[PDB]
Curated annotation (Swiss-Prot), chain B:
Belongs to the dynein heavy chain family. Homodimer. The cytoplasmic dynein 1 complex consists of two catalytic heavy chains (HCs) and a number of non-catalytic subunits presented by intermediate chains (ICs), light intermediate chains (LICs) and light chains (LCs); the composition seems to vary in respect to the IC, LIC and LC composition. The heavy chain homodimer serves as a scaffold for the probable homodimeric assembly of the respective non-catalytic subunits. The ICs and LICs bind directly to the HC dimer and dynein LCs assemble on the IC dimer. Interacts with DYNC1LI1; DYNC1LI1 and DYNC1LI2 bind mutually exclusive to DYNC1H1. Dynein heavy chains probably consist of an N-terminal stem (which binds cargo and interacts with other dynein components), and the head or motor domain. The motor contains six tandemly-linked AAA domains in the head, which form a ring. A stalk-like structure (formed by two of the coiled coil domains) protrudes between AAA 4 and AAA 5 and terminates in a microtubule-binding site. A seventh domain may also contribute to this ring; it is not clear whether the N-terminus or the C-terminus forms this extra domain. The gene is DYNC1H1. It is linked to Charcot-Marie-Tooth disease, axonal, type 2O: An axonal form of Charcot-Marie-Tooth disease, a disorder of the peripheral nervous system, characterized by progressive weakness and atrophy, initially of the peroneal muscles and later of the distal muscles of the arms. Charcot-Marie-Tooth disease is classified in two main groups on the basis of electrophysiologic properties and histopathology: primary peripheral demyelinating neuropathies (designated CMT1 when they are dominantly inherited) and primary peripheral axonal neuropathies (CMT2). This is Cytoplasmic dynein 1 heavy chain 1. It is found in: Cytoplasm, Cytoskeleton. It comes from the Eukaryota. It comes from Homo sapiens. Cytoplasmic dynein 1 acts as a motor for the intracellular retrograde motility of vesicles and organelles along microtubules. Dynein has ATPase activity; the force-producing power stroke is thought to occur on release of ADP. Plays a role in mitotic spindle assembly and metaphase plate congression.
Length: 97, 48
């Protein structure tokens, strides 16, 4: 059969897509790591964890979500984890207030 | 070069010490459980 199975332009595009997908997966991992702490800070009881504790949990979640690389932040995972951490911190602060 | 397998003075002392150790271990375990229950009852932090 006639097939271009070599490292052609399709192969280069597939390699670029694989690299972008690896960056997106790393972003997803870093965002999940941040979002775990963010969700913990959000779901902690409002009476039990004060607004300062909620803010500290939100900051820790943001720092975890920003631990992804530049390609990780280009992937949606890191930005989503940062958003989840900020939302958890805001929810904990509102519950404490 | 030793005594036979009878209830001699050493064997009776060992049995009495074993009974005392078993009673002490049971009392200590029940005391730990009761103290855990008392700590759980007294844990009343008004924040949570």
């Amino acid at each position: 059969l006639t097939d271009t199975g070599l490292l052609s332009g399709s192969e280069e595009r597939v390699q670029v897509a694989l690299e972008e997908l690896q960056d997106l997966k790393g972003v997803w991992s870093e965002l999940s790591k941040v979002w775990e702490q963010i969700d913990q800070m959000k779901e902690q009881p409002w009476v039990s964890v004060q607004p300062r504790k909620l803010r500290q949990n939100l900051d820790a979640l943001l720092n975890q979500l920003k631990s992804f690389p530049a390609r990780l932040r280009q992937y949606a995972s890191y930005e989503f984890v940062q958003r989840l951490l900020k939302g958890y911190m805001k929810i904990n602060m509102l519950v404490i207030e």
